[PDB]
Design a protein around this ligand. Structure first.
Ligand SMILES: C[C@H](N)P(=O)(O)C[C@H](CC(=O)O)C(=O)O
Ligand SMILES: [Zn+2]
Ligand SMILES: [Zn+2]
Length: 391
């Protein structure tokens, strides 16, 4: 059979545990959670990267649904609760295809019955409003990982896409990691600065993850992971879940975006300005310089290097579907995973290597977080520390 046919067979046995899908945010922005307007039980290809049929075609067996909220707007906690509510509603609306998962055991139970294990991951420490009790509340509601920062620094952690702040993690930042370790919430290092990555690895007593980050050695961009950090994963026991974002994985795209941003500033606009006037400037740039397109090969290049440095037992996949506008050819939506697996097969990846990449590593890591949590919960009570006291 073809590599694609083989890929589908392999995924039927050990499906993909995707680390970051922003369907909730997309639903929030597109229809303000009017789920009937974007029923994922129907074909949503015209509006979203995600729907149930495409997830099945793509071989997704577990999904960490992102409950991301903007860090540049007030009421982050309320918004996070609304994002969590959206995930809960989706699970309740589609019992035949989805199953809520809070543990590694739940993930296996879902796989055994043929349902997509649905977990939640918060994206940005701003979601806890400098409150450890709030962190515990999010865990109680089902959140199983939290990206320490999003695109901007918060009071206790530095973002890779912001200027240096506290120098990685502040004293309270380390306290947050300790509490996440005690609760059993995975520390997600995507988005954070390299300094923050190292501070988190020094502090965490549990395996950490990168829900959606690729290789900095392959593509030099702050959102990607440095080799020195990848090297520490084997000891930490964590995993880096490769992402598909073109402007992060394709060199030409990284350069194009940098030049597009410079062009915006050249016209007196902040590179993130979305006004009609700013859009005119960007449109003119794309007119003379077409946007480069990434491919499955681009993503495979990152996985090959990540495997060499981090090890096959420390890799995963975090597509970032519905969280980013552009996608690599062959990975246009959630139904594309088989194309990536086929490419890896053509590159010599073994069936067991691939089962680890898609399913086994993710389950091991969540189980490890649970194991570390059992020990810490029995050893001490929860922290009542405040950011004022520590910082
Ligand atoms: C804003 C989304 N929750 P995200 O998941 O943070 C997507 C970005 C890339 C982009 O803006 O396209 C990233 O992950 O770094
Ligand atoms: Zn992100
Ligand atoms: Zn996101």
């Amino acid at each position: 059979m073809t590599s694609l046919e083989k890929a589908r067979e392999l995924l039927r046995e050990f499906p993909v545990v995707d680390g970051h899908n922003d369907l909730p945010w997309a639903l929030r922005e597109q229809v303000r959670y009017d789920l009937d307007a974007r029923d994922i039980a129907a074909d949503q290809s015209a509006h979203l990267h995600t729907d149930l049929a495409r997830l099945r075609s793509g071989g997704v067996g577990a999904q960490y649904w992102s409950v991301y909220v903007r860090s540049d707007l007030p009421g982050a906690v309320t918004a996070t609760l609304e994002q969590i509510d959206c995930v809960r509603r989706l699970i309740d609306r589609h019992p035949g295809e989805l199953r809520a998962a809070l543990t590694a055991a739940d993930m296996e139970a879902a796989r055994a019955e043929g349902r997509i294990a649905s977990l939640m991951g918060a994206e940005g420490g701003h979601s806890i409003d400098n409150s450890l009790a709030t962190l515990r509340a999010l865990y109680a509601l089902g959140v199983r990982y939290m990206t320490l920062t999003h695109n901007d620094n918060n009071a206790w952690a530095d973002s890779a896409t912001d200027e240096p702040g506290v120098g990685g993690l502040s004293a309270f930042g380390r306290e947050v990691v300790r509490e996440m370790n005690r609760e059993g919430m995975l520390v997600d290092l995507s988005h954070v600065a390299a300094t923050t990555m190292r501070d988190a690895l020094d502090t965490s007593t549990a395996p950490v993850i990168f829900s959606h980050s690729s290789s900095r050695a392959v593509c030099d961009h702050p959102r990607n992971i440095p080799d020195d950090v990848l090297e520490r994963l084997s000891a930490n026991g964590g995993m880096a879940m490769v992402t598909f974002v073109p402007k992060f994985v394709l060199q030409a795209a990284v350069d194009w975006t940098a030049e597009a941003d410079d062009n915006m500033r050249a016209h007196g606009f902040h590179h993130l300005d979305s006004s009609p006037e700013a859009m005119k400037v960007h449109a003119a740039f794309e007119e003379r310089v077409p946007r480069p397109v990434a491919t499955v090969s681009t993503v495979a290049d990152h996985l090959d290097h990540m495997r060499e440095v981090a090890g096959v037992d420390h890799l995963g996949i975090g597509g970032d579907y519905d969280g980013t506008p552009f996608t690599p050819d062959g990975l246009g939506d959630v139904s594309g995973y088989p194309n990536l697996i086929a490419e890896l097969l053509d590159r010599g990846w073994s069936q067991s290597d691939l089962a680890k990449l898609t399913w086994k590593n993710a389950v091991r890591v969540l189980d490890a977080a649970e194991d570390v949590s059992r020990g810490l919960r029995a050893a001490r009570g929860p922290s009542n520390a405040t950011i004022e006291q520590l910082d």
